[PDB]
Structure 1
Amino acid sequence: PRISRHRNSSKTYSTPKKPFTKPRLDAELKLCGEYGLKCKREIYRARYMLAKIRRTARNLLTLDENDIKRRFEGAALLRRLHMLGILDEEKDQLDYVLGLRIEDIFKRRLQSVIVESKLAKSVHHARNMIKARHISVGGQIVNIPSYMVRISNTSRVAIADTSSLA
């Protein structure tokens, strides 16, 4: 067989069960307003990634406090959530992995980082400037709007010094 038959691939979003439901059909465009979202697949994707960390946490929390699998994956899960900035330092217990939301995932996009840093007038301006290739992340130039910035790479957001803007 050609060697390409052996590559893995996978879907990254889940579509809600009841589509035509007014109350959250409204709070769903509210999110497309408070950030610059092309369509609903980027809310679906955020729900998809929150669901998995929730499922892992419930699996671990069924278990017992002195157990090895807790001692392994709880520490791993908290470390990766803290370094992505989905969870902050003061909450170092697994039971806090349950009370997150989509919004704290959205907070660490570049479009949010540069608006905290005030590098763009707004979020829609931030989007257009992202694709114009004008903002770099620590000396390397990042074309991605959905880019997820570790709080280590979060001090080094700025204009890309090769740009019409220095």
Structure 2
Amino acid sequence: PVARSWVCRKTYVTPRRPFEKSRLDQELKLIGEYGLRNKREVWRVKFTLAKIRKAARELLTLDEKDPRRLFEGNALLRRLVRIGVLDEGKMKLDYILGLKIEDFLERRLQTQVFKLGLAKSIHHARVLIRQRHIRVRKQVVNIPSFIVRLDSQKHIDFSLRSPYGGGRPGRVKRKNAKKG
């Protein structure tokens, strides 16, 4: 007997057909457009979207006044509009089935750093976040997969210790200054 917890789960699904040309092209389009590292990030976002769709599809078979349908559907919709994937105007259970993978990929911190102009390209945004240059509110965030909530969008600064936003030159600049 141990005080440890063995609860864990896989966060992606490997596709059934490994060599579908259209699937490969679409996944490469997503990777290139959003600057992802491998197909596992695409499959992870696919898995989260599939689980959300599955919950919505199950809740849509219940009666429209079933208290569990009301509670759980309202919670799911509030969560979906919290991270900005779903517009609050479209807050019915049937609009969850209309969401795409790119809506969830848009909310990534990599995409948001690229969009807010802190980076010149999406890959630059990835290397920026991974190099402790980007902070959300007051917290330095190293994870490009960080899904930014709506209330957190307005606060994505350039860190208070990063050379680009905080005012301490890095190793390269300091060495070049010491050369002269």
Provide the TM-score with structure 1 as the length reference.
Answer: 0.96
What is aligned with 1:3?
Answer: 3
TM-superposed deviation, 1:31: 1.1
Distance 2:128 2:41 in 1: 19
Task: Name the aligned partner's letter for residue 49 of structure 1.
Answer: T
Q: Confirm or deny that 1:24 pairs with 2:13.
A: no
- How many residues matched? 165
Distance 2:49 2:95 in 1: 13
SS in 1 for 2:150: coil
Superposition pairs of residues 53-92 of structure 1, within 5 angstroms: 53-92=52-91
- Deviating beyond 3 angstroms after TM superposition, the runs of 4 or more aligned structure 1 residues are none
Distance 1:20 1:93 in 2: 37
More contact order relative to length (CA 8 Å, sep ≥ 6) = 1
Distance 1:165 1:46 in 2: 31
TM-superposed deviation, 1:18: 0.5
TM-superposed deviation, 1:17: 0.4
SS in 1 for 2:135: strand
Task: Name the aligned partner's letter for residue 3 of structure 1.
Answer: A
What is aligned with 1:97?
Answer: 96
Considering only CA atoms, is the larger Rg found in Structure 1 or Structure 2? 2
Q: What per-residue deviation string (whole Å, max 9, x for no partner) do you get for residues 21-72 of structure 1?
A: 1122112111111011111111110111011111111111001111101111
Q: CA-atom RMSD, angstroms?
A: 1.0
Distance 1:2 1:43 in 2: 36
Q: What per-residue deviation string (whole Å, max 9, x for no partner) do you get for residues 131-163 of structure 1?
A: 111111001111111111111111100100111
Flag structure 1 segments of 5+ consecutive residues without an equivalent: none
TM-superposed deviation, 1:130: 0.9
Task: Name the aligned partner's letter for residue 122 of structure 2.
Answer: V
What is aligned with 1:110?
Answer: 109
Provide the TM-score with structure 2 as the length reference.
Answer: 0.88
Identity rate, percent? 54
Distance 1:2 1:115 in 2: 45
